[model samples]
Target: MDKSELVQKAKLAEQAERYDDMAAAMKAVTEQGHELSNEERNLLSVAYKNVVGARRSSWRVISSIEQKTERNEKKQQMGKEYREKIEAELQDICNDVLELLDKYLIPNATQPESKVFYLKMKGDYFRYLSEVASGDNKQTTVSNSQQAYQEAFEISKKEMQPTHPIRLGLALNFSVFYYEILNSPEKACSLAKTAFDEAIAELDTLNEESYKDSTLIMQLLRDNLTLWTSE
Candidate 1:
């Protein structure tokens, strides 16, 4: 293929996550005595390096899991002894994560309301850790994260006496948090919908004539409620 065609194919391969194809295209260009500019060579090198880095990172995360004792047929085919050795190491790593969480929770002296926020943040971190635990993710950790947010909402409701605007924010936050961070898109959309409906219902109960001149708090709530849209 001509240099221009090969270059275009390389760009397409990169876009499609076909790293091997991109590398092959670049090699073909080089073999044909096509001289690549320094800038072009550098870009190709970086792209190849990034593809390698992505593979390494993905495997490293997968290797940290503790629960696989009997290797799958495919894994066994890859190398049975190597799989078993990695699995043993994973058990130790799992124990270490538990110990770390225990250490983190031991020194906190926050009040109940503050503890709610603290726990919710802990949930977020836990969900992040879940991504690294196994190559395959489960919904249990995410559900736990949602429960933490619910607890936060309850505490805010009781102690903080949160205004409508604040409650709306919390609702929207949890919904997006569930979908984006926790990987539960449906629950996230549902929570956002409820938040919008509730905020509107509350707004309707306001003094009719003075609604137009409502305070910034109400205005902001209204704005947030309106921002929810289907993607």
Candidate 2:
């Protein structure tokens, strides 16, 4: 199939929440040895994000059950084993997306926008891997996530305006990585607060095209700070 057909099918599968189909279609396009346009990149990321995102949520619930089955050691172990299997599945999905980004997307991205986007997507997938990993694996994902997000943050800050949606998104996700994955609420708050302040200062200068995306991320950033401080 052609790239656009696959992309369209990916979008349709996405609308139906058939992430497996979505991911397969998107993957076919990327694996065809062509660099993706921005919309194509979004299709790829969105497809895999839903796939791994659902698994992480499942991991949490399974974890809660595993920890709570204290009286039934066998059941607890079973839960642990099941969770481990799912973690491996999550790792597979995350790493596949990362490979796609590193191999096909990032190297060919000439503009800073695509650069920051692919970098942030890499950070996000690694952070998802870190969610269920531990010991050295945990250490690796955490560090990789930090490295990618940090690089993207620097590039976004340098090349984009404060009000640019992609820049705001990089800040939002990077701050989220600090808060959720790194267990550093203070750093998360500081990061989110700074992004919020800077963007708010530039709110008037924001163009109509980016206003909604930028403000929506700004709200999430604000909400995170509020939630972090209170909880």
Candidate 3:
């Protein structure tokens, strides 16, 4: 259905406290960037807010499900079942988002810049899924974070010039996140410097006017550097 029809349905669903339907309908609205009638817009906004809130709370609970399963292992067989259920649920969410992007957004890329943005967004979402898998493997030998990092980097390289400052910076940031959060501090620091070098090279290639206005980009680079260094 179209965004407006979804928005109208969302309003009715929300007023009836049918939150799941509200969230689902509002997802279509946000995805399409359609203008909503005032009442429908307010309902859609509230539904999205609810989705965000639910996601945040659910993440914490799901992240700890493995631990809960471990403890319950000594008492009953329910832990493993619940752990698998949560894992499946998380994976389903990841797959659903990817499906939505593939179905509605990626194929519509009509410009080079827009295509770049779409690829980056898809890569970022994959990165997030990899992160979730990494969390699930925190105490094990599994390394989904590295796999995610590799996938994200490859996609970035495919869609953006390897030397593009943004691409370079993002690759470094991903390396730093995996290293510091999932691997070794020493490695993180070493890799961070490599990222800085790329940023500097990008700056060197830019005109003075452009370089000066790149404060936000510089800040992000520095922040990633600091994070890695602190590890």
Root-mean-square deviation per candidate: 16.2, 3.2, 6.8
Error of 2 at 188 (Å): 4.1
Instruction: Write down the TM-score of every candidate.
Output: 0.39, 0.81, 0.53
Candidate 2, after superposition: displacement of residue 225 in Å?
6.3
lDDT values for all models = 0.54, 0.87, 0.57
Compared with the true structure, the alpha-carbon lDDT of candidate 3 equals 0.57
TM-score of 3: 0.53
Clashes of 1: 0
Model 2 per-residue lDDT at 154: 97
Candidate 1: stretches off by over 4 Å: 1-110, 135-137, 164-169, 181-190, 193-228
User: Which segments of model 2 are wrong by more than 4 Å?
Assistant: 71-73, 183-231
19: Cα error in model 3, Å: 6.9
**Cα lDDT of model 1 by residue, 1-231, tens digit:** 888898788888888888767866765654553344544454455454554445445546555442353556665444445544544443343333333323433134245544454455445544544544444444665666667678767765565433344455666567667667766766666666655555555665666766544335445444543554334
Q: Which consecutive 10 residues in model 3 have the weakest lDDT in total?
A: 139-148
Per-residue lDDT of candidate 3, residues 21-107 (tens digit): 897886677577333344654564466445544544566675566455555455435545554565566566545545655665456
Alpha carbon lDDT at 150, candidate 3 = 54
* Candidate No. with top TM-score: 2
Error of 3 at 191 (Å): 5.9
